[PDB]
From a paper:
Bacterial RNA polymerase (RNAP) holoenzyme initiates transcription by recognizing the conserved –35 and –10 promoter elements that are optimally separated by a 17-bp spacer. The MerR family of transcriptional regulators activate suboptimal 19–20 bp spacer promoters in response to myriad cellular signals, ranging from heavy metals to drug-like compounds. Here we report one crystal structure of a multidrug-sensing MerR family regulator EcmrR and nine cryo-electron microscopy structures that capture the EcmrR-dependent transcription process from promoter opening to initial transcription to RNA elongation. These structures reveal that EcmrR is a dual ligand-binding factor that reshapes the suboptimal 19-bp spacer DNA to enable optimal promoter recognition, sustains promoter remodeling to stabilize initial transcribing complexes, and finally dissociates from the promoter to reverse DNA remodeling and facilitate the transition to elongation.
Numbering used by the authors:
A (entry chain D): 303 to 804
B (entry chain C): 3 to 1341
C (entry chain F): 512 to 562
D (entry chain D): 1308 to 1357
The structure:
RNA sequence: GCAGU
């Protein structure tokens, strides 16, 4: 009886006919596989599909792309009822056969039944509430869902094989919550901090950064424009480059104290690209919001300013327009990473030779007993870290300003248009912590226990790492990978405990 | 040069001259299993050792014995392919010759009465195919090698993990191969404790008292005695000087001379030097010097017979004055010098309750079997069977070797059981380590960790079976019928066969083979796994066993490891890595004798790798051998440093010594991050083979080794000339130099055509050679899947451009042009078997029939009259493949359809349509149909048709191979006959059957004619012997599962084209999902109008620093740039001199490259064939860590008239205007990975629900339903989505009355729910009430 | 396949259940039969409902 | 702690659902407890509106 | 068990 109620609670568990312990009554209801957690708090669910996600950058913020062959199964009783209702089927058996044969009329019915019907898209692990958002489906012909780019950061979703589940809200209350509470246009701020989470990202930020920069002697510099439309005309006609410093007549509106928009027209010292980008900025925002090279944070501040000043309905339009224009002018950019983009500073070899000479003198000071191996080790580490910082500073000083170009004959240095630097400086992808490993040196690596090896990787990834340097780097690479693979099961357990306390 | 590798020569940019060729990559599996099954005369390995481990089996009394003469392996009943078709294990029967020796009742020495020897059969053992795989129940399985802890003794510690006091607690652990663990440890107060099988701890001296040591013997073993020969002067004390090392002397030492050190001082080693140089050995100490000293001997009073002082008792002044009355001159005392020597054993003996052998044995018994009353001969048999019985404990040969090597003994060989001195030496080394005189072992050192492979695990399981048989034979030889039985009446084959069967089929290490491409197989066979029986568990393995130890260098790849929960537990054997005779990974090194790096190679294991200084493979050296630099970078003890040229002992044998065969295929591995290299090495093994294999324009040179060492290709066994080439077979006329006497001299190679892999891909061999061309030994004759002219081709060389394109490559997406779908580049064939099993239900048999009820007549158009589909039939989803019906009854239809039957009259049928249909979305061709019919069931017309087809094919193939072989034999006869006594114009008229009896004059060649005629006659006999066996295997019944009548297997062949969603990748960790298939006119294009095949993202390079994917691109631009020149010279039909000149310029290019391709020796036809194979880009070889420098890539770009920066100006396809910056355009080698969106997409509205809980079923095979788990419920609770949540809980999963109402409301146009209680909650209330608990619902 | 999170128990479906398409078919057949018997004389329509 | 406070709620359905089902259910049984379905988990368990 | 995110 005690093995029936709780097997293994008193002494040896009874094991039958597979040499595996029998599952008792208490084991049915407890644990991660018990009723309480596996069947009652979460459960398998009808009307639910799943597929790979792809970009679909043509979408609006409230739209997803839903495969026709997924939406024809997810909405089967809706199509059966609309075939019965519209007279196209005399029965539910006739409508079932019509959907099964996939006639040309069930696709018109399917276009009818999904029209204003949201679906919830979910990427597990659902770490926070923005891991489930509603979207209106746009029927596409693929087999992969087309997830809007701006919401990817909310889902923590890249398109490298991620799958997402689609759920259909059936009732009018469920549809109205998908539309009012969970729709992705309602979700543009984060609930953890009040900052935007529907926010532009790597390609978008790089497009808007490349458009809003300035070059010194660019084509079409110095002219005076009647506004943003003439700037777009000049750029598309190829009569002026996107970076030509120019004078544009800008009309900007500010919300007065009474609450309406009062205008002001002034000649702004601008570039052609910021003039072009001004065409998508809604009215109550100032010109100082685009008259700068727009990195990731400047774009996020643009969106936050628009949300506070104008509200949600102008902000979703602004976010979609920002995404379209960033994608467009990153495509026109031809921004490409070659191997010459990773310029190694020509001072790297002599800085490394100086540090090698210095560690040789600390080694002869150790051989002559002046210093103990502890202080010798520490001094070699510090005169390798000083050399690493020297190499990184020389690399970044070479990489950020290598553009020296001619204004009326006089050479003049400007911020570099290098692609690796344009990606890092945008905040599109990467930081100087990776540019330093591409074009600098990648420095002191640690042992598996944490004690850093006294001789560093004096190479970078543009040059090769030899067999020993590569093995030494794998030491820390696999440690990071194992901590990543073993701390998700700890952060999820902390989140579970916090949810069940609060 | 070669003949298969001068068709197309891969230009090598490698610079270090290779000294050791890559070994046979599957020698781990094959060598291990060969050691298992092969005959061993000395009885060390495999089956012979397992038999001698158990046999001879003596009876309980000794009247009879069962001994073992020899064993044999039978012939397998079915071939590998017949076992894959009939779904049976490919095994061989184990025929063991046993001998029952029976004596008379009372014999002087066991003089025998009779001997009865016969060949018993015990089990079948699965054989390993010649590629390292096992065919087990038809599926090919790979037994993955295991990295487990070597048996021995390991000293370790916890570094203040206990008592919060920073006291490191040491522990020794004896791990046997088979047996019981034995632990010693220190507690926070330095009492030595013992554990057995990790149960609660005893004092460690209890096991010393279980052995017959008394207390004074224990103190004699673990101590050294200080002796007080108490002379006239108070406690005259004998002394050796070094005992005075490092203590605070509060007493002065005076002995015929100086007072050496004043009282109240600490003394130094120079004072000991003083005391030993003035030669004082006998001193005068104060009276209280004995207060605290522990006696060593049991001091007894011979006057009264009473022991006046027991051993291990602290002597005091009152006790000293007590025993001084007895007239005792010498007082022995345990010498305990703190911080050099320990009281540990004495203070341990102060804790244990036992004082003799029986009390200690009783305490060990109460520890081991608690609650069972111990008797003397029960406890003293339990302890003797724990560690000291050779059938219940084994410290095996590797265990004894590691055991003696730890304790620094001289012998490497010994007994498998423990001894007194083994346990004493383990305790002694633990005490030494506590005293700072040693260091604890590193548990994940690869010299403390060893490889247990298929042939050792299988022998272990076979020995488990043999002991399960030995117990039964001992239970049988204790009976009185011993004069009538034979030894096969005693052996049940089912224990042995069940042990071996469960190991090979259902173990954790016997894994379903990953058969995607050749690389997947060849790296699943070289797999090492810390998991498994006797290993770790992935949930309880810490961060430290998952790390890259410094000893994996050359033995285990640091890169190639999984990414999920088991990372660093599944390892991949590196390229040159080998195993010891004990199972310790060893790696090859070139000896450096005097600075001349000798080409002599020595395989060093991990323990002997640290004694030496080992130079890098990247260390420069001249043709002489000396290191041209003077401070060589080397590895001395596990750390890396610079050494002089004279110190260096060994050198690495190659630069790919450190990485596995999967990571050695990544070009420019030295420029990728190790994370991205891990991802690329893991994603190469997932690429599916495309229609036409395309070599890599940038490769590493390991392609040929991987493609040849995997058995996917057809490699010529003997050189020759291709007599006949055909898509289904290659017939090679062997050279005269390579054929034996009395042999046809013809090798036939039958090619695998369109068969199913384990992963439902197509494996298909295409002949590579042409008719009449010469082949050599080792030349690839026919390709395999993912193989191009004998190289490993896992993908296609797509022309990529690195630029952002309108957001369609956002966040690792891939833009693909329509000319990749047009040219069928990543179209892959996938073969699926689908089984229709006509069973015997209890209502009657299900029948395979074509008259299916209530189905259209057009649906049965593709079925033949027997109910099965035609071969070649193009089927789409839903189509009937095998028409089947199950008999049903007890209809009991509702009154409304009863009236419906009454009106229209269509009477329902007694059968139900249970036919096999194509799954939805699947569309392909039926390429094979197999019908397995149970013996006794009459075969339908289709089964008899398939059988006549099989018999015609078997007879035709056997007759055709006989015609081929007999034609070769007659050609050889004709060649011998014209070597002397030539009838060449007479023999052409004489028919071929008359040449045998043509007597030639016998100089010597009449012996050749004898042997060739005998060969022909036995060929004719073997043809019939094979044909009758093929006929009886075809027409015989099938051993199906009980209950099933017949099985029809339909093999669909689907062609999956590339489409948005399909996961594509490169070799550098740059995965991505195709996001659009773009038209050709929408792609960017160069000044010549060539559009770009694939547009990748530049933003995926700089943060995840896989720079290799850039260089591979820049070099793939160069390679193809060479080809686009040769192709041009092949279009103007240039003279072969200009082609020879340009190809020699392309092969000479590079900075002191190791290869020399001299086209001066190529004939003009060979130059033309080479240039025709190079017109699609010249294949380049960039070996790992000595590959092509960027300067050489720029020089190759200059040679092909390309921009040396690797970047051209592109134009937009849609608007025709130039992209503002130069774009990196080149040729990246892309791979289509097996994560296809066809197999991912799934949706359900409703369907089948689960049985106990009424929730939907699991996955897309059971029609799915997505788990709306716990975190998603928190997501809907964080919004105020109370109704969405409620309908996810009630009317979509569990509300049984509510989900049908929901369906009928959605259909009737009313989107409203009526939720009730979820049925899982009713299951929960019924399961809580089945405990004694009353849970209710109140109201 | 040694997969602990799955078992044999959650691949076994409940075959005795009725498909909600068949429940909708039954209720639709009830409605259709009720109308096409409402298109008759009450006497004979009740004879059919009664028989 | 968050565990010792999750397990000490006045609602035995939430606490038994969280972890240590056996201890919570025996304490609730011998205490003759009552759970009024006031939080969110007890209304998700029984399929109600939260 | 093995992979994917
Ligand atoms: C003859 C050979 C070299 C001498 C010795 C040294 C290492 C020994 C093996 C290991 O001990 C592992 C294993 C232990 C089992 O108990 C019996 C089988 C195994 C394979 C042993 C067989 C044999 O004894 C070996 C190969
Ligand atoms: C060229 C070669 C040696 C001369 C002759 C001698 C034996 C001939 C084969 C056999 O006849 C079997 C078979 C018969 C089919 O009909 C056609 C194919 C086969 C393979 C033949 C091919 C070819 O004709 C062979 C190889
Ligand atoms: Mg992803």
């Amino acid at each position: 009886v005690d093995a029936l109620l709780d097997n293994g609670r008193r002494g040896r568990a009874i094991t039958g006919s597979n040499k595996r312990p029998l599952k008792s009554l208490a084991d049915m209801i407890k644990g991660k596989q018990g009723r309480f957690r596996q069947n009652l708090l979460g459960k398998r669910v009808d009307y639910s599909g799943r597929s790979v996600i792809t970009v679909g950058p043509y979408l609006r913020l409230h739209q997803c792309g839903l495969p026709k062959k997924m939406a024809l199964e997810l909405f089967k009783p809706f199509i059966y009822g609309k075939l019965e209702l519209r007279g196209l089927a005399t029965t539910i058996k006739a409508a079932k056969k019509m959907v099964e044969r996939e006639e040309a009329v069930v696709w018109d019915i399917l276009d009818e039944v999904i029209r204003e019907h949201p679906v919830l898209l979910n990427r597990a692990p659902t770490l926070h509430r923005l891991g489930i958002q509603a979207f209106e489906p746009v029927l596409i012909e693929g087999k992969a869902i087309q997830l809007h780019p701006l919401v990817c950061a909310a889902y923590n979703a890249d398109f490298d094989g991620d799958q997402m589940a689609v759920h259909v809200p059936l009732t009018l209350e469920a549809q109205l919550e998908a539309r009012a509470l969970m729709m992705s246009t309602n979700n543009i701020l984060s609930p953890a901090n009040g900052e935007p989470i529907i926010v532009p990202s790597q390609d978008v930020v790089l497009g808007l950064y490349y458009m809003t920069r300035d070059c010194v002697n660019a084509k079409g510099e110095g002219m005076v424009l009647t506004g943003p439309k003439e700037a777009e005309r000049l750029y598309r006609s190829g009569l002026a480059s996107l970076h030509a410093r120019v004078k544009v007549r800008i009309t900007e509106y500010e919300k007065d104290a009474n609450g309406e928009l009062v205008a002001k027209t002034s000649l702004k010292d601008t570039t052609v690209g910021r003039a072009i980008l001004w065409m998508i900025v809604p009215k109550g925002l100032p010109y100082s919001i685009v008259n700068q090279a727009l990195g990731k944070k400047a774009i996020s501040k643009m969106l936050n300013t628009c949300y506070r000043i104008l509200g949600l309905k102008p902000t979703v339009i602004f976010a979609d327009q920002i995404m379209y224009t960033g994608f467009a002018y990153a495509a026109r950019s031809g921004a490409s990473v070659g191997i010459d983009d990773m310029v190694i500073p020509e001072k790297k070899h002599e800085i490394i030779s100086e540090a090698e000479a210095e560690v040789a003198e600390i080694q002869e000071q150790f051989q002559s007993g002046l210093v103990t191996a502890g202080e010798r080790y520490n001094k070699v580490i510090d005169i390798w870290a000083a050399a690493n910082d020297r190499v990184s500073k020389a690399m970044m000083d070479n990489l950020q300003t290598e553009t020296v170009i001619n204004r009326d004959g006089q050479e003049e240095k400007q911020v570099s248009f290098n692609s690796i630097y344009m990606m890092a400086d945008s905040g599109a992808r990467g930081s100087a912590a990776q540019i330093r490993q591409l074009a600098g040196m990648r420095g002191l690596m640690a042992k598996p226990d944490g004690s850093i090896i006294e001789t560093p990787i004096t190479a970078n990834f543009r040059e090769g790492l030899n067999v020993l340097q590569y093995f030494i780097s794998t030491h820390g690479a696999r440690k990071g990978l194992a901590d990543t693979a073993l701390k998700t099961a700890n952060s999820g357990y902390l989140t579970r405990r916090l949810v069940d306390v609060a | 040069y070669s003949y298969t590798e001068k068709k197309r020569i891969r230009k090598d940019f490698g610079k270090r001259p290779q000294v050791l060729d890559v070994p046979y990559l599957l020698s781990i599996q094959l060598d291990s299993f060969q050691k298992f099954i092969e005959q061993d005369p000395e009885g060390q390995y495999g089956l012979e050792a397992a038999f001698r481990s158990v046999f001879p089996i003596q009876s309980y009394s000794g009247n009879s014995e069962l001994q073992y003469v020899s064993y044999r392996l039978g012939e397998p009943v079915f071939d590998v392919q017949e076992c894959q078709i009939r779904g049976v294990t490919y095994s061989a029967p184990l025929r063991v010759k046993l001998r029952l020796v029976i004596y008379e009742r009372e014999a002087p020495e066991g003089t025998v009465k009779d001997i009865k020897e016969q060949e018993v059969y015990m089990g079948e053992i699965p054989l390993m195919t010649d590629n390292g795989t096992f065919v087990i129940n038809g599926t090919e399985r790979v037994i993955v090698s295991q990295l487990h802890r070597s048996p021995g003794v390991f000293f370790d510690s916890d570094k203040g993990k206990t008592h919060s006091s920073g006291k490191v607690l040491y522990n020794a652990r004896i791990i046997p191969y088979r047996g019981s663990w034995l632990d010693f440890e220190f507690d926070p107060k330095d009492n030595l404790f013992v554990r057995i099988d990790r149960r609660r701890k005893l004092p460690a001296t209890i096991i010393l008292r279980a052995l017959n040591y008394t207390t004074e013997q224990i103190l004699d073993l673990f101590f050294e005695k200080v002796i007080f020969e108490i002379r006239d002067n108070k406690l005259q004390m004998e002394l050796v000087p070094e005992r005075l090392r490092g203590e605070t002397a509060s007493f002065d030492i005076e002995a015929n001379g100086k007072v050496y050190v004043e009282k109240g001082r600490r003394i130094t080693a120079r004072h000991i030097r003083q005391l030993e140089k003035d030669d004082v050995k006998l001193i005068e100490v104060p009276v209280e010097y004995i207060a605290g000293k522990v006696v060593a001997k049991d001091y007894i009073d011979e006057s009264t017979g009473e022991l006046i002082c027991a051993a291990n008792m602290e002597l005091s002044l009152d006790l000293l004055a007590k025993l001084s009355q007895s007239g005792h001159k010498r007082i022995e005392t345990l010498f305990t010098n703190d911080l050099d020597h320990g009281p540990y054993i004495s203070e341990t003996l102060r804790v244990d309750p036992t004082n003799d052998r029986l009390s200690a044995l009783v305490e060990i018994y109460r520890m081991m079997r608690p609650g069972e009353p111990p008797t003397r001969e029960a406890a003293e048999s339990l302890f003797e069977n724990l560690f000291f019985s050779e059938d219940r404990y084994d410290l095996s040969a590797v265990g004894r070797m590691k055991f003696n090597r730890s304790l620094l003994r001289e012998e490497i060989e010994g007994s498998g059981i423990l001894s007194k001195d083994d346990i004493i030496d383990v305790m002694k080394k633990l005490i030494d380590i506590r005293n700072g005189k040693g260091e604890v072992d590193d548990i994940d050192h690869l010299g403390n960790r060893r490889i247990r492979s298929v042939g050792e695990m299988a022998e272990n399981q076979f020995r488990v079976g043999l002991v399960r048989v030995e117990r039964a034979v001992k239970e049988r030889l204790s009976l009185g019928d011993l004069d009538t039985l034979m030894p096969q009446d005693m052996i049940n084959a089912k224990p042995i066969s069940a042990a071996v069967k469960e190991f090979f089929g259902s173990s954790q290490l016997s894994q379903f083979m990953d058969q995607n491409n050749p690389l997947s197989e060849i790296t699943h066979k070289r797999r090492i796994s810390a998991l498994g029986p006797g290993g770790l568990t992935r949930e309880r393995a810490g961060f430290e066993v998952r790390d890259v130890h410094p000893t994996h260098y050359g033995r285990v790849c640091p890169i190639e490891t999984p990414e999920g929960p088991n990372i660093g537990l599944i390892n991949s054997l590196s390229v040159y890595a080998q195993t010891n005779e004990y199972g310790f990974l060893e790696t090859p090194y070139r000896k450096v004798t005097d600075g001349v790096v000798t080409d002599e190679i020595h395989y060093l294991s991990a323990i002997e790798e640290g004694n030496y200084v080992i130079a890098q493979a990247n260390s420069n050296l001249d043709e002489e051998g000396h290191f041209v630099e003077d401070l060589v970078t080397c590895r001395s003890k596990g750390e890396s440093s610079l050494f002089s040229r004279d110190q260096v002992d060994y050198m690495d044998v190659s630069t790919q010594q450190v990485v596995s065969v999967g990571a050695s295929l990544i070009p420019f591995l030295e420029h990728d991050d190790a994370n991205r290299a891990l991802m690329g090495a893991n994603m190469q093994r997932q690429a599916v083979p495309t229609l036409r294999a395309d070599k890599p324009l940038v490769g590493t040179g390991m392609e040929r080794a991987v493609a040849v060492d995997s058995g996917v290709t057809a490699v010529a066994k003997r050189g020759g000339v291709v007599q006949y080439v055909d898509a289904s077979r290659i017939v090679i006329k062997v050279n005269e130099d390579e054929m034996y006497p009395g042999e046809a001299g013809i090798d036939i190679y039958n090619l695998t055509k369109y068969t199913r892999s384990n992963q439902n891909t197509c494996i298909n061999q295409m002949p590579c050679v042409s008719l009449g061309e010469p082949v050599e030994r080792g030349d690839v004759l026919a390709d395999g899947p993912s193989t191009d002219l004998g190289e490993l081709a896992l993908g296609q060389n797509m022309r990529v451009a690195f630029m952002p394109w309108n957001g369609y490559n956002f966040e690792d997406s891939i833009l693909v042009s329509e000319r990749v779908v047009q040219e069928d580049r990543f179209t892959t064939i996938h073969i699926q078997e689908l089984a229709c099993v006509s069973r015997d239900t209890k209502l009657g048999p299900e029948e395979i029939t074509a008259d299916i009820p209530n189905v259209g007549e057009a649906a049965l158009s593709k079925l033949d009259e027997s109910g099965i589909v035609y071969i070649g039939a193009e089927v789409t989803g839903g189509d009937i493949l095998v028409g089947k019906v199950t008999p049903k009854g007890e209809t009991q239809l509702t009154p409304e359809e009863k009236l419906l039957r009454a009106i229209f009259g269509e009477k329902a049928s007694d059968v139900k349509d249970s036919s096999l249909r194509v799954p939805n979305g699947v569309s392909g061709t039926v390429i094979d149909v197999q019908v397995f019919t149970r013996d006794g069931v009459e075969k339908d017309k289709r089964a008899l048709e398939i059988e006549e087809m099989q018999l015609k094919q078997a007879k035709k193939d056997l007759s055709e191979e006989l015609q081929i072989l007999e034609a070769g034999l007659f050609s050889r006869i004709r060649a011998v006959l014209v070597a002397g006594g030539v009838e060449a114009e007479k023999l052409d008229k004489l028919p071929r059957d008359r040449w045998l009896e043509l007597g030639l004059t016998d100089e010597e060649k009449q012996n050749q004619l004898e042997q060739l005629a005998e060969q022909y006659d036995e060929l004719k006999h073997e043809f019939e012997k094979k044909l009758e066996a093929k006929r009886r295997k075809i027409t015989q019944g099938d051993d199906l599962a009980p209950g099933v009548l017949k099985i029809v297997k339909v093999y669909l062949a689907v062609k999956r084209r590339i489409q948005p969603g399909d996961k594509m990748a490169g070799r550098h960790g740059n995965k991505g999902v195709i996001s659009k298939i773009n038209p050709i006119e929408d792609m960017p294009y160069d000044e010549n109008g060539t559009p770009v095949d694939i547009v990748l993202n530049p933003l995926g390079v700089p943060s995840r620093m896989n720079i290799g994917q850039i260089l591979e691109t820049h070099l793939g631009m160069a390679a193809k740039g060479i080809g686009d020149k040769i192709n041009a010279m092949l279009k103007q039909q240039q003279e072969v001199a200009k082609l020879r000149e340009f190809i020699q310029r392309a092969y000479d290019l590079g900075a002191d490259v190791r290869q020399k391709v001299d086209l001066s020796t190529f004939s003009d036809e060979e130059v033309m064939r080479l240039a025709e194979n190079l017109r699609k880009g010249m294949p380049i070889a960039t070996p790992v860590f000595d590959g092509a420098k960027e300067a050489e890539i720029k020089e190759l770009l200059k040679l092909g008239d390309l921009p040396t920066s690797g970047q051209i100006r592109l134009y937009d396809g849609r608007t025709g205007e130039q992209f503002e910056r130069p774009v990196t355009v080149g040729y990246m080698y892309m791979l289509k990975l097996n994560h296809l969106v066809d197999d991912k997409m799934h949706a359900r509205s409703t369907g089948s629900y689960s049985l106990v809980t009424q929730q939907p079923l699991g996955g897309k095979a059971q029609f799915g339903g997505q788990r709306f788990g716990e975190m998603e419920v928190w997501a809907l609770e964080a919004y105020g989505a109370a109704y969405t949540l409620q309908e996810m809980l009630t009317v979509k999963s569990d509300d049984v009355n509510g989900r049908t109402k929901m369906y009928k409301n959605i259909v009737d146009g009313n989107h409203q729910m009526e939720p009730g209680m979820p049925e899982s909650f009713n299951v929960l209330l019924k399961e809580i009430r089945s405990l004694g608990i009353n849970i209710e619902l109140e109201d | 396949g040694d997969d602990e999170d799955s078992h044999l128990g959650d691949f076994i479906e409940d075959t005795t259940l009725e498909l909600p398409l068949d429940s909708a078919t039954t209720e639709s057949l009830r409605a259709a039969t009720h109308d096409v018997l409402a298109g008759l004389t009450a006497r004979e329509a009740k004879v059919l409902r009664m028989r | 702690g968050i565990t010792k406070a999750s397990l000490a709620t006045e609602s035995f359905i939430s606490a038994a659902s969280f972890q240590e089902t056996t201890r919570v259910l025996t304490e609730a049984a011998v205490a003759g407890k009552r759970d009024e379905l006031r939080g969110l988990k007890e209304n998700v368990i029984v399929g109600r509106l939260i």
